[PDB]
Design brief:
binds zinc ion; acetylation
């Protein structure tokens, strides 16, 4: 079954999911000098004031904070998007060391980690239907670098002890994802895919230019998580990132000059 190791990692995924070699796969390298400023792009609208978090969960490939998406509470709109996208969950990708971990790269630069806030288009009714559409999902990608602590992340970090292994989950209510956003909403955008199986080509990517800083102690707690279930040989959940994929016939647009 798929993972990030030598024998089941990204280089193997195409066997079960042939779309892995498709025309709009993610992540990609963002070449900042080739990305064109698009004055027709709208500002991003990130409306998270009424977000209702539910649970935090180790799913064997990341940890995930899930939200109540049964109403328009926390929504993404504007930017390159048409219509309304509901926040379902967020998760992270990170490295074994600070010099790798992000999925997107910027001029080949790898960040220590990458946050993905996953939203689905309300015109398709549920996320299962949305992932079967070219404009079904919008994922907001935020880079993490190591420096000063991110206060808004600490409540997440402090509960990771309770979900060490695959399949563990905990109540995680009243978490405010606004505390994970950088100051600027300047972004790059391109059409792409889920970066984990099934790798469905259903995502409008919105990747913020400004990283957030997290502390070494915060990211160290990420690295104590396990891929494995309880009672199995301990394998640290680290380097759970897919590398950059061919850009092919796509253009990355910038919201900023
Ligand atoms: Zn992700």
């Amino acid at each position: 079954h798929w993972g990030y190791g030598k024998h089941n990692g990204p280089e193997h995924w195409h066997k079960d999911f042939p779309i892995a070699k498709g025309e709009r796969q993610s992540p990609v390298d963002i070449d900042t000098h080739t990305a064109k400023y698009d004055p027709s792009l709208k500002p991003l609208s990130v409306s998270y004031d009424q977000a209702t978090s539910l649970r935090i969960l180790n799913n064997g490939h990341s940890f995930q904070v899930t939200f109540d998406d049964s109403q328009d509470k926390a929504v993404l709109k504007g930017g390159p998007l048409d219509g309304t996208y509901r926040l379902l969950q967020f998760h992270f990708h990170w490295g074994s060391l600070d010099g790798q971990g992000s999925e997107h790269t910027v001029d080949k630069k790898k960040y220590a980690a990458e946050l993905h806030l996953v939203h689905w288009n309300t015109k398709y009714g549920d996320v299962g239907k949305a992932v079967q559409q070219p404009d079904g999902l919008a994922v907001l990608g935020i880079f993490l670098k190591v420096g000063s602590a991110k206060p808004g992340l600490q409540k997440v970090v402090d509960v990771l002890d309770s979900i060490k292994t695959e399949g563990k989950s905990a109540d995680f209510t009243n978490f405010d994802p606004r505390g994970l956003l950088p100051e600027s909403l300047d972004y790059w955008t391109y059409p792409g895919s889920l970066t984990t199986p099934p790798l469905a080509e259903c995502v409008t990517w919105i990747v913020l230019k400004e990283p957030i800083s997290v502390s070494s102690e915060q990211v160290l707690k990420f690295r104590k998580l396990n891929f494995n279930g309880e009672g199995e040989p301990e394998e640290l959940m680290v380097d759970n990132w897919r590398p950059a994929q061919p850009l092919k016939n796509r253009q990355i647009k910038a919201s900023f000059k």
